[PDB]
Amino acid sequence: EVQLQASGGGLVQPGGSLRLSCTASGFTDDYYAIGWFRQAPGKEREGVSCITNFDGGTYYADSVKSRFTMSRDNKNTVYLQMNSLKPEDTAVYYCAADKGLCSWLRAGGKVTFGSWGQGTQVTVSSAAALE
Known part of the structure; x- marks a missing residue:
């Protein structure tokens, strides 16, 4: 069965x-x-x-191109390494898959002819230093 299992959010x-x-x-x-x-x-x-x-070709939104890195582990997992995190990166992040379109990279971030999992919260805030 087709599944997209996510993980890794938090406050940083x-x-x-x-x-x-x-x-x-x-x-x-x-x-x-x-x-x-x-x-x-x-x-x-x-x-x-x-x-x-x-081909394993990788595409990034202009807002994250020099800070984020995607990689894969062939078990069937893709990873998004986020670095130099900014408060503007605070969001619910959704894993998505589509029929070779990368549709969510078009303006508006809408998945088309695809699938998406549950969101994972990523918060970038000074509040993180208070743990």
Whole structure:
């Protein structure tokens, strides 16, 4: 059965790091794409990153291109390493997969002809130093 299991959210200080994971099960077509989009408080959805299963090509939204890195573990997991985190990165992050489109990277961050899992909260705040 097709599943997208997520994990790795939390509260971190600005300049910090967090890693999100998404384990994709049951995908047998070579042409899927997997990645993330996010929903920041009071903002419209925004695409974050995408990896195409064919060729392993990686795509990033301009807002995260030099700070975030996506990687894969062939068990069926993709990782989003977030570094130099900024308060504006605070959002609910959703793992998504589509039919090789990376649709959520178009303006508006809307998945089309795809699938998405449950959100994971990532908060970047000075409040994190108070644990």
